[PDB]
Amino acid sequence: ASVVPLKDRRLLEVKLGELPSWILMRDFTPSGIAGAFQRGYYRYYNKYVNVKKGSVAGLSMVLAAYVVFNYCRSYKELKHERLRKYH
Amino acid sequence: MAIHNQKGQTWSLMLMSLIMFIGSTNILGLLPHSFTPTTQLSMNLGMAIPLWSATV
Amino acid sequence: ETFSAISTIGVLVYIVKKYGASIGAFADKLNEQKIAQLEEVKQASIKQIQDA
Amino acid sequence: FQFTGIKKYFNSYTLTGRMNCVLATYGGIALLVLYFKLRSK
Amino acid sequence: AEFLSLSKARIEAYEKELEKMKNIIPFDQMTIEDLNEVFPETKLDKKKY
Amino acid sequence: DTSTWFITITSMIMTLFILFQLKISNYSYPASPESIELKTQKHSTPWEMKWTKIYL
């Protein structure tokens, strides 16, 4: 299962930030020069447009994953919910 | 690097690893529900004493 | 008690403003890096040819 | 191979840096007072 | 004629050095070891600054 | 909170300083690149001096 999780990050790196150099990867390096940031763009609304060379959607997905992963542990403690739903 | 200027410059390639760890693990925790390991007093008594007594 | 969830996500929106200037610094670093090799190859080339 | 990349570094500075025994002794004694206070409750 | 004998190989070795120097520069994003011939590396604790 | 008992984190901090000394060790310094241009100049100049001594 180690080659399973290692081939997750090497797919979620070389697609959406940032596909490096070292030829045998030279045209693979310019594949990130256009970037899949245009693919990553449409989730927010439009506003994080600065991802061109400081790439927001490359980084801000991991940090959005690490928040909802830590929302699970806190859920047991801060229950607060009545015999209903909220507004 | 600039202050020391000795053959105690060998030690300084570690001290920039020490700045990135608690530079990051203090900056991650500002997020909504994250947890910082440098909150607990346990590891900081293991960051001081194996480094401080490495000097004397 | 997580209305401080938005304000740590609101401040990270203001830095996306300066991130469109961080492309130049990041971009600038790459270009500055690029000029040195170009100077070096030309410098290396002239010395070798004239010594022959 | 998490060794020979940094093995030249270790025996350089672990002569003084790998003195966690003082941390181990100041840790192991710090174990003793907390098991003792819960023993006397 | 010892200059015409000995430095003649020194001319062709310098001429062959201009051939391999064209080879190394290559693509902008080429390699981290092929650029490690001209610009140097050394043993532990050489670069002071 | 006032937590206790400490047998935790501190053994999981020194495994981390096998990671950070692995990543940061493979960095590049801009300055080292200006040093290799100096020794290439003096070598062919002495080689031309070896060719000048091949004349003189």
PDB file of C-alpha atoms in Angstrom, chain A residues 10 13 15 23 29 33 37 45 55-56 67 74-76 80 82 87:
ATOM      1  CA  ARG A  10       3.143  12.198  -7.522  1.00  0.00           C
ATOM      2  CA  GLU A  13       1.971  17.286  -7.744  1.00  0.00           C
ATOM      3  CA  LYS A  15      -0.616  17.972 -12.536  1.00  0.00           C
ATOM      4  CA  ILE A  23      15.334  16.908 -18.948  1.00  0.00           C
ATOM      5  CA  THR A  29       8.475  20.999 -17.246  1.00  0.00           C
ATOM      6  CA  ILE A  33       4.263  26.353 -17.653  1.00  0.00           C
ATOM      7  CA  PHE A  37      -4.191  26.022 -12.880  1.00  0.00           C
ATOM      8  CA  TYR A  45     -15.446  31.831  -7.938  1.00  0.00           C
ATOM      9  CA  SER A  55       0.160  29.341  -7.572  1.00  0.00           C
ATOM     10  CA  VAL A  56      -2.692  29.550  -5.071  1.00  0.00           C
ATOM     11  CA  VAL A  67      -8.899  21.692   7.720  1.00  0.00           C
ATOM     12  CA  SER A  74     -13.228  18.005  16.938  1.00  0.00           C
ATOM     13  CA  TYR A  75     -16.747  16.846  16.071  1.00  0.00           C
ATOM     14  CA  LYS A  76     -17.134  14.521  19.058  1.00  0.00           C
ATOM     15  CA  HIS A  80     -24.171  21.194  20.576  1.00  0.00           C
ATOM     16  CA  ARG A  82     -30.504  19.691  19.403  1.00  0.00           C
ATOM     17  CA  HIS A  87     -31.446  27.396  10.202  1.00  0.00           C
TER      18      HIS A  87
END
